[PDB]
Point group: D2
Chain length 404, copies 4
C-alpha cells in the first residue's frame, strides 16, 4: 500500500533506521559537544545492539529500511550523487583548495564506501597525499583544530524527516550542522526506487532554502489519527515552522486539526516526555506533561492566513484523549529525578500493546506489562547511552490507522 | 579623501560606532546568553559614557558616524527600507500571522523611532493590540517564551564585529551565530543606500547578506590591515579557514594586498584584537599566554597555483613575523592580562583604539597597563568602563574605521 | 546603650563594614571562582565607593565600625593575635615547612599591615627569601598551582555574624574557606574593647568546632522585632543549624517565635529576594517570595526538644505581616529576568523610610520614593559588580526597636 | 602473611572492593552531582558485573573482601557500632529532632540491613512514621529538599579512594569533599574493630577521622607504592602538598620509605592512577597529554633539616624518573586516551588493576588498548564497563590492595 503514517500505535509495516558506524568511530571526549552527541560509545557493541533491534522488528514481518543501504543505492544513480555533492561540497564548506580533490576522490569510491563517508564524515587523513590535506593536517597538529563532519545523530532517524499521513516533512533542523543529515535523507526520498515512483506529498521543508527561525524536529511530531496531528512547541520546534506546517496540511485537507503541545521553559522534544503504547495508553514524565499547554489549530476560511488558534481549557492529556474520541487515556508515569530510577518514555510501538523498549527500564517496563503491553527489549548500554530510545531511532514510513 | 583603512595606527579620519540603546533596555539576566551578551548594563549610564567616548574623538577632528544616525537617514529612502524589510520580515522569521501587521506598523513609524526598533528589537507589546499579538503574549506568559517579534541586537555596540574596511574595500562579514547576521544586514543596507557610501568608490572584498556562507565565518576583531601591503587575520573559533581563503583570494585578485598573515590561535572564543593590539608604529600590547603560542602562516598570491595563492608556516614567533612584515627589527611590547601573575592589581589593557601614532583611547580602570603605556611614550585618553566594558568591550571593538591614513 | 539588633528598620546606631582591599588586589579571572567571588573589580575605585558609603552613614550620626580597624586594634593584644594565629597557621593549612617562617614574619609586622594580610592573604612572594617560599614559587611557575588565601568576601560583613536582639551568631559558613572570615570576626568580638567588656550573648556557633551539615549565613537571618526572627532555609542555611539556633534563643527567652522562610529549589539568601524599607514596606522578587513556604517554630515545654513546628497556611508575606501586628505589608516588586531591568532588593535601612541603595536601580528606587522612602544612593560599578548591596555590606550591631 | 602492599604489579593476595548497592538505587539525574557521582546506573546489572569482577579474582586464589561483608561483621561488635553511630548521628548531621529516633531504628536493625543503610543512606520514608520524619517529607515535597537523613555513598564502589596500604601501613585519607569523609569513617571503623584487622600488625601512616585536616587532602588514586623503597604520589586537585608532606614525613620517620616521588600534575579533577598505570614490571599505560607534562619532585629524608626531608625537582621526564627509580633503563609504554588522534575508535585503557606481573583486569570496551596490551605481553582479563565504567571507574579505582607481594 501507499506510503504514509496514520497513527502512533497502528501496525508498523515499513520503518527507516540507521546503524551506528563511521560517524561514531570519529567520536572523542573532546569533540562530542561540537558533534552534538552526548558521549563516546563502544561502536562495535552499539552495532550489534542496533542489529538485534533491527532483527527483532524484521522477525515480526516489519520491513526495516537501513539508511546506509538506501544511501548506497541512491548514490548509484549519477544524478543523485551529483545532487548531494553539489550541495555538500562547496568552497564555503570545504575550502577553496580542497573541493576538487575531495570530490574527485569521493567520486572514485565504491558505492557502499562512499555512503559510509557521506554519513561518517571525511578526515584529512583519508585523503590521498596532497598539499591541501597537508595544510589541514598542520592546523590539527599545531593548533588542535574534519573536511566533512561526521553525522553521529543519523542513528536517530526520527529527527530529520516525519511522515504525517500521506506525506512527509523534510525538517529544517535547529543546529545548522544537522541540516547535512536532512540533505542526505532528502536525496533518498527524491531519487531512491522505494520513493521516486511512490505517491506522497512533501508537506513542508526544503534543504535548498534557509527557514531562519523556522525549525522542526521529529520528536515533536506525531500523527495520532482521526485527522489530528500533535506537534510539540519548545526549544527545538518553533511557532514559525509549526504554523507553516499546519497551513500546508490544511490546504491539502490532509488534517482537520493540529494540536500544539506547548512545552514550558535543557532542550526536550514531545516524544521524550510523552509516548503511545496502545490505543488508549501512554507513558509520561508527569513533571513536564502536566504543564503542557494545549493549543488547537484548525482550518478557518474567514481568516487571512486560513486557520484559527484556541488555547484549550483542559489538560493536555484530556485534550489528546478527546481528540481521539476516547473517554480518557490510561497513563503510566515514568522519569522524575521502585528499586531505582528509570525513564521508560520513548518506546516505539510495533502494533497496539506491542512495544520495544530498553532492558534497563525494569520498573516502568513492569508497569507497561501490568497495563497489558508486551515489551520487547534491546540493550541500551551504547544505543541509549544518552538521549532517545526506540522512538528516536525509528522513522515510520508505513503505519496503518487505528480507529475512532 | 577616498574611503579606506591603511594601517592600525595611522590618523583616524572617519569612524562608525554605535551607541547602546533600546536593545540593551531589553536585556534581562535570563535572556542575556541567548542574546549573546555578557550581562545587563545600566543603559542610561552606558549611553552617557558612549557619548563621552564619541565626543572625545570628535573633539579631535575625527568624523564619527553614529549607526543610529546613519540608519535613520538610510531608511528615509523608500527603496532602502523595502530592501531591509524584505529580508528582515518573513514567515520564517516572524511567523505567517504577524508579517503584515508588523510590516505595516513599522512602515508607519517616524524614521528615528523606526531605526531604534530595527536595532533594538520589537516586542509583542509594542504592536497595536490584535489577535496575532495577543497570542505571542500568551506564549510568553503561559510558557515563558521570549516575547520578541524581532530580536534586539545589543552587540551593535561593537561596530568592529560586522564589517572591516581593508585598504579601500570592505568586508560584510558572515558571523558565527546566525542571529548576528541581522546586524550585518543593517550595516550592509547603510553601505549600500546611504549618501556617505552609495556614491563613494570602494571595493566589496568579501561577504553578502543574501547568501548562506555555510562554514565560512569572519569576525571583525580578527581582521587588521597593518599596512605595507600586509593584512593580519586571526583564525580561531570565529574566523574560519574557509572564509579567510576567499577573503585573501579576493584581495590578491585586485592586488589590494601582497600578503595575508594568518594568525593561528590555539584551542572560550577570542578574536585577535582581544589579545593583541597596536598603539604606535612599533608598539603593541599583548596577552602573552595566547600570543607566544600563535602560529603564523603567510598567504601570498601565486600564479603557479590552481587556486592562486601559496601558504607557508613561519618558524619565527608571530611577534617577530609581524615585526619583519612591517620593516622593523623588533616590536616594542607591553604585556597585559594574565590570570595569574609584580603589580597592584590585575587588568587587561588590550583593545585600545589608536587615534594617531602614540595616541590611544583606553579604559580608566586599567591603571597599571595605562601607565606602562604612558612610560612607553603613548598619550592614553581614558573613558569609563563600568558599563561599556562590563565584559568583552574595548575601544577597538567599539569602532569600525572607515578612513585611516597609512603610516610608512 | 547595650549591643543588640531589635528590628530591620529601627534607627541604626552602630554597624560594622569592611572595605575592599588587599584580598581584592589578589583577584584574577582565573582564581575568582576558587576565591568564591564573582569577578575582578577596580579595587581603588571600589575603595572610594565604599568610603562614600561609609561617609554617608557617618554624616547621619551612625557609628560605623570598619573591620580592618577593629582587627588592627584587636591584634595589638598579644593574646588575641596568638589566638588567631594558633588557629590560622597549622601544618594542615600552611604546610610543615612554612608554619614557622610564616608566623615569625607575620609576627614582626606592624599592626595595621598584619591586619591587612590576615584579610588579604599572603603570597609566597611576600615572604622573605626562603627555601619553602621557593618551592611554592616553583609549583606556581611549573604547575600553575596562596600560603594564606585572600578573603575577598569580608567586604560583605553581613555573611559571617548576626546580631539577633541581645546576642550574636558566629555563623558556620557553607564553604569551608569562608570559615576563615568567621574566625577573624570572632577574635574581634572576643578581645576587642568595643566587645570584650560589653554584655551580650553568643546564641550559636563556634570557630573551634565542626558543625558538619549545620550551616547558617547572615543574609538569611533577620530579627524583625516583636520577639520574632525570620530565618531563610535554602541552599546556605540548613535546618540542622536553624533548629539549634532557635532552641538556643528559646532557652534564653530571647525570642518568642522563629519564622522559617522555606526557599524553593543557584544559591540565594532571604535578603537577596526580600528586604524591609519601613515599618510596613518591603521590596520583593515576586518570583521567589510567592513560593516561600512559611513554617512557624515556637517554644514548647511538652516536647523532648523544647519546640514545635507548624507549616503556616497563609503566604509568607501575610505571615510576616501578622507577626508584626500589621494588617498587611505594602510591597514593591523588583527583579524578574520600565525603561530597563533592575533588582533593587537588598537595600540597607538606616531608619524608618530612609534607605541606602545603588544608583543604577532607577526604576525601583523611583517606586521606593513614590512609596514614601528616602533613597540615598552609592555607586555599584565595583561594589555591586555581582552579588549583594547595602544590606550584604553591613552587619548591624546596635539598632533600636520599632513597635507593635 | 603480614598486611602490606609492596609494589603495583606483585602478586595480589588480598583486596577490598565494594559492590554497588542501595546507595546507587537512590541516584537520580537531579541528585547525581550533589552525590558526587557521574550518572544513574542500572544497579542490578552493575551488581552482576561487579560480582563477575570479584569472581574472576577469587577464582585465581585472591582473597577478596567485600566492604558490605566486612561492615556487617564489624557492627556486630557493640563497641564498633557505637563508635560509628557516635560520629555519624548528631544534631549537626541529622538535626536535633531526629537523632534519637534515627539511632534507635538503626540499632534495631539486623546487621546486614544496618550495613546496607550505613553505606546506602537513609531516607525520611525509611523510618517508622513520626512527627520528625513527616516534616522532612514535607520539606522534600513542598520545597524539593533532598529527603536523605543520612546521605548515600555511591562512591564506596571505588575502594581505592579512601585508604591506601603503603608497605605495611595504611593511610585513612582526608577527602577533598567533606561528604566523602563519611566513607573513610566507615572504612576506618573496619580497620579498627574487624578481626581481619584489629589483631594484625601494621602502621597507621597518616590520617584520622576524628580530626579536621583543613587544607590537607589525600586521595587513593594518587598513591602508589611502586616498591624498591619508592612511593609515587600525585599532586593535583585532590591531593595537596600539605598532606603529601606529612605522609612522607611519617613514612620517613619509621624508615618505611627511602623516597617519595611527587608527581606534579599541571592545571577537571584527575588522579595519577587515572592517566598512569602499571601492567608489568617494566610496562605502563599512559595518557600522553598529561604524562608528558608531569613535573617530578624527589622527596628524601634528610637529618640536616628542621622538618626532616629535602625536596629536589627532577630535570628528566616523569617516565624517565620512574624508570630510574625502579632500576630500569626505560619503561615500556602503551599510549591510550587522547581526545584527538591511526585507530578504529577512541578508548581509554588506563586504570586496569594488575593481579600478577603481566596479568591484568580491564574493560571489555577498550578493544584497541587491550590488544596493544596483549601484543606487549599482557594477559588481559576483561569485565563489562556498561554500568561500572559509566564514568571514571576502572579496575584500579575499584580495588584497595591490602596484601601485594614485592617484585625486585
Amino acid at each position: 500500500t501507499k506510503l504514509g503514517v496514520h497513527s502512533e500505535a497502528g501496525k508498523l509495516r515499513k520503518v527507516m533506521v540507521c546503524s551506528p558506524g563511521l560517524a561514531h568511530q570519529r567520536l572523542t571526549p573532546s569533540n562530542c559537544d561540537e558533534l552534538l552527541f552526548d558521549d563516546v560509545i563502544w561502536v562495535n557493541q552499539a552495532k550489534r545492539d542496533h542489529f538485534d533491534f533491527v532483527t527483532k522488528m524484521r522477525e515480526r514481518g516489519i520491513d526495516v529500511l537501513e539508511m546506509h543501504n538506501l544511501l548506497t543505492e541512491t548514490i548509484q544513480n549519477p544524478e543523485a550523487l551529483k545532487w548531494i555533492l553539489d550541495r555538500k561540497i562547496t568552497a564555503d564548506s570545504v575550502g577553496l583548495g580542497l573541493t576538487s580533490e575531495l570530490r574527485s576522490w569521493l567520486e572514485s569510491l565504491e558505492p557502499r564506501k562512499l555512503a559510509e563517508y557521506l554519513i561518517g564524515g571525511v578526515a584529512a587523513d583519508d585523503l590521498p597525499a596532497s598539499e591541501g590535506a597537508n595544510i589541514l593536517k598542520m592546523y590539527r597538529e599545531y593548533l588542535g583544530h574534519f573536511l566533512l563532519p561526521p553525522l553521529p545523530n543519523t542513528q536517530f532517524t526520527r529527527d530529520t524527516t516525519c511522515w504525517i499521513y500521506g506525506g512527509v516533512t523534510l525538517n529544517p533542523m535547529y543546529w545548522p550542522a544537522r541540516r547535512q543529515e536532512t540533505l542526505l535523507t532528502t536525496a533518498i526520498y527524491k531519487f531512491h526506487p522505494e520513493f521516486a515512483n511512490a505517491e506522497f506529498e512533501i508537506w513542508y521543508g526544503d534543504p535548498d532554502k534557509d527557514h531562519g527561525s523556522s525549525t522542526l524536529e521529529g520528536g515533536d511530531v506525531m500523527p495520532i489519527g482521526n485527522g489530528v496531528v500533535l506537534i510539540g512547541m519548545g526549544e527545538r520546534s518553533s511557532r514559525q515552522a509549526i504554523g507553516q506546517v499546519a497551513q500546508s496540511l490544511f490546504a491539502k485537507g490532509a488534517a482537520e486539526r493540529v494540536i500544539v503541545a506547548g512545552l514550558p521553559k535543557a532542550a526536550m522534544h514531545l516524544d521524550t516526555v510523552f509516548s503511545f503504547c496502545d490505543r488508549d495508553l501512554v507513558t509520561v514524565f508527569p513533571e513536564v506533561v502536566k504543564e503542557i499547554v494545549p493549543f488547537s489549530l484548525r482550518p478557518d476560511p474567514s481568516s487571512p492566513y486560513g486557520m484559527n488558534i484556541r488555547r484549550e481549557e483542559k489538560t493536555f492529556l484530556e485534550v489528546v484523549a478527546e481528540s481521539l474520541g476516547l473517554k480518557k487515556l490510561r497513563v503510566v508515569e515514568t522519569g522524575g529525578n521502585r528499586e531505582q530510577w528509570d525513564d521508560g518514555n520513548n518506546v516505539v510501538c510495533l502494533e497496539p500493546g506491542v512495544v520495544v523498549g530498553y532492558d534497563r527500564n525494569t520498573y516502568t517496563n513492569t508497569l507497561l506489562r501490568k497495563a497489558g503491553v508486551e515489551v520487547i527489549t534491546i540493550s541500551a548500554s551504547e544505543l541509549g547511552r544518552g538521549r532517545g530510545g526506540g522512538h528516536c531511532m525509528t522513522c515510520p514510513i508505513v503505519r496503518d490507522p487505528i480507529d475512532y
